[PDB]
Design a protein around this ligand. Structure first.
Ligand SMILES: Nc1nc2c(ncn2[C@@H]2O[C@@H]3COP(=O)(O)O[C@H]4[C@@H](O)[C@H](n5cnc6c(N)ncnc65)O[C@@H]4COP(=O)(O)O[C@H]3[C@H]2O)c(=O)[nH]1
Lengths: 147, 140
């Protein structure tokens, strides 16, 4: 599966290092909410701009996480939307925005993108559960509400 | 196929917007060298640290590229190693470091397929003179 590979890279190179680092830095109950779109149109610039405005309205700022953990890593600085003064984070998975290019009538490809989205989150959720991270890693809708 | 997905995301979300932006910014002949291993032991933390110290020694520093282009993206600020005072850049593809976790030397098969697709995307976008591949010693 192509989406499984993208989920593995997203988890192993971003979500897992971020939450592991934050826990070591002292935060005992940090939360990373991962945006979970369903439909192809949620990957458009219009929906991305909506979420970016919403992050600003709710006082999130793009912030760095410096990595000090073990592990082969070419990047040592992660960037995550972080709520002001609060141990909550948000991410729109950028990798999902490559799915249309990968798949490439125009309507048939959009439905294939939506199946890849579903499989992406199928694998990502599996990885979260297998690392017992459900208390820290959750999924957010368009309104940054859990589930 | 999984290696193709990783290469497409690496090209579409990083290499292609980076080179397009810096050209739009007025860099006429910028160069990006992409590290290309082929042995599994080149993805170890020891080899990565040698590349990092080498980049430092050759006066490369992480440089910010602000994306103002057309296209949907959730991440608008890229970071890329840039040689001091020169339109020359280097990247170790971080996405390669997930191939072991996705999977003996079947990883090296995936690495070869990653670079076949990546090299294909460079040719199809007429970027063969701007984007090349480098070894552990930052040589083409
Ligand atoms: N918000 C956020 N998301 C991240 C970060 N690092 C990774 N991600 C996400 O994991 C995916 C795979 O990461 P990778 O580091 O293993 O491969 C990356 C990496 O090899 C490269 N790349 C992208 N942005 C980069 C960057 N800022 N610096 C260095 N390399 C970068 O492009 C590949 C695909 O990027 P992507 O945006 O499509 O998907 C990321 C992205 O969705 C991060 O630091 N912040």
């Amino acid at each position: 599966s192509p989406a499984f590979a993208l989920a593995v890279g997203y988890f192993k190179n971003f979500i897992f290092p971020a939450i592991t680092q934050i826990k070591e830095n002292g935060e005992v109950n940090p939360k990373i909410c991962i945006y979970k779109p369903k439909h192809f149109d949620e990957l458009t610039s219009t929906n991305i701009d909506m979420i970016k405005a919403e992050l600003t309205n709710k006082k999130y700022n793009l912030s760095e996480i410096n990595l000090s953990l073990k592990g082969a890593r070419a990047r040592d600085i992660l960037t995550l939307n972080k709520k002001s003064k609060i141990h909550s984070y948000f991410d729109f998975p950028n990798t999902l925005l490559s799915l249309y290019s990968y798949v490439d009538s125009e309507l048939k490809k959009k439905k294939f993108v939506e199946l890849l989205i579903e499989q992406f989150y199928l694998k990502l959720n599996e990885l979260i559960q297998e690392n017992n991270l459900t208390n820290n890693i959750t999924f957010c809708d368009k309104n940054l509400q859990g589930l």
